[model samples]
Target: NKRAPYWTNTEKMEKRLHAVPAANTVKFRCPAGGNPMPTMRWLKNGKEFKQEHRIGGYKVRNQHWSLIMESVVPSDKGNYTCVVENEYGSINHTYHLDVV
Candidate 1:
């Protein structure tokens, strides 16, 4: 049997607001629980980023299944979304980022 992806940390992750100064680091986590573990995807400012885009300190980490941005700049200020999905269905959470 299989089930749709369900967030495992919404108590804090739900619509969380993040604030970081320029050149600082940030970590956005997306974890779900289901019969079959779901796949995670990240989007910034309404645009989806693929493997080619994640590099040079910006990467999706498997250690905790999160997206980490090292030395973030002002341009990184925007919406950061974590979408988790499996064959059953998908669920998403978004965080507003403000860079100083």
Candidate 2:
């Protein structure tokens, strides 16, 4: 028997923080791919977003494959990575969230 594919990759996610910088509501986008469609997540400093209590949880693609982040704050500023994985493997691309 043969195992399922063992490789996943994400295309270059090209996006812009949103026109007219705002203290709240950040915007992001992930490029389309073949096998492993990219996924979205939010991280701060070096930990998964907890919730609004502390700062704010990572509001990723709750419904769509397009990874987009909203309401970017100082705390939200961190190493944001879009994890793209599949049955084969996973590929991640990190993006720096900056406050404008």
Candidate 3:
């Protein structure tokens, strides 16, 4: 079947440490396409990342999901994964976050 979920922009920034000049909003958005649509989840260090005030995760629309970090700190650096699942199947994308 040709109804599997696939990422629209999967090429990331070399999967290395990313830096910001100062406190800023770091957003990771994954947009996918499929037949029956999909749902998304964000994971930090291979575990469910509890949604907090500064750290937030949401689904935008049209199979687009995002994880946003505000005023990032050193402890925020880690591996993040976005999983999209539907009745048809599932897919995942991982990103490394580093604050300088």
Candidate 4:
């Protein structure tokens, strides 16, 4: 008998997430399939975004995820990326927030 593999292959999907009524929070999610478990992180203007500006987080699916940013500022109006990575590999998607 053959034992199960250590884990599945790594996968990164390109997603286009959106939010209405431009608020101080944003959300995102990704597809499933990876080893060592996928890690979800947020970035703004190519920089790491911490929970300091995060309101909360939500799980959309098995591999899906979400993040709420509090007090979305003008500077926050730019291309934000949701980085999903693991020991196998990494991937990211972008979202543009307009604080109008």
Candidate 5:
């Protein structure tokens, strides 16, 4: 039987104390373990986030995935979700970006 992907960390909220606009890059990672090697994608404002110049990059491994932003802006402040899925099921872990 297939197993559902699970996050290594349970705490979901992450706040950036002094997030500089267009001067800092923020990375959100989801370390999950599952069979069949889950695939990952990122979402912003409840919509699929497409890759752009500002969106730095993403890395995936057997049990880890990450998203990085090159230059974070105020607009980047939103609910960012990490979606991981496999044949068993799909799970979403959201991270709150607080830009000050």
Candidate 6:
């Protein structure tokens, strides 16, 4: 059997904080891979985040789960989480977006 879900870029900067300037589009990349192709979702401050049209949201492209925030809002300053899961198991990555 194949292995469970795991982060391919966790070694880079998964479990860390990201500093960004306000009022700009920010893309938080969640790079993960698994046997059964892990599915992922984004969260803010440990809560579920929604993909609103006004403020760009999650996008799964080229095996990358990217959280694209089009407009910088007060809600942007929070703990961003990428939870990757599969039938076998699950994994998570934490990204604290500090809007400066």
What number of backbone clashes does candidate 3 have, counting pairs of residues 3 or more apart or in separate chains?
0
Q: What tens digits encode model 3's per-residue C-alpha lDDT throughout 44-81?
A: 88888775523433333333467767777777778878
Worst 10 residues of 1 by lDDT: 49-58
Residue 66 error for model 1, in Å? 0.9
- lDDT for model 6, please: 0.74
User: Which model is ahead, 2 or 4, in terms of lDDT?
Assistant: 4
* Local distance difference test, each candidate: 0.79, 0.48, 0.69, 0.55, 0.70, 0.74
Model 1 Cα displacement at 4 (Å)?
0.8
Ranked candidates (lDDT, high to low): 1, 6, 5, 3, 4, 2
Write out the backbone clash pairs for model 6: none
* Tens digits of per-residue lDDT for model 2, 28-84: 444434344434444445466555534444445534444445565554555555555
Question: What is model 6's C-alpha RMSD?
Answer: 2.3
lDDT of 4 by residue, 6-92 (tens): 223233324343444544455544443455567677787789776554444322334446555555555556667767777666777
TM-score of each: 0.85, 0.53, 0.76, 0.57, 0.74, 0.80
Clashing pairs in 2: 6-88, 7-88, 25-71, 26-71
Error of 2 at 98 (Å): 1.1
Top-TM-score candidate index: 1
Error of 4 at 43 (Å): 0.8
Candidate 4 Cα outliers beyond 4 Å, as residue runs: 1-25, 53-64, 70-73
Error of 6 at 82 (Å): 0.2
Candidate number of the best lDDT? 1
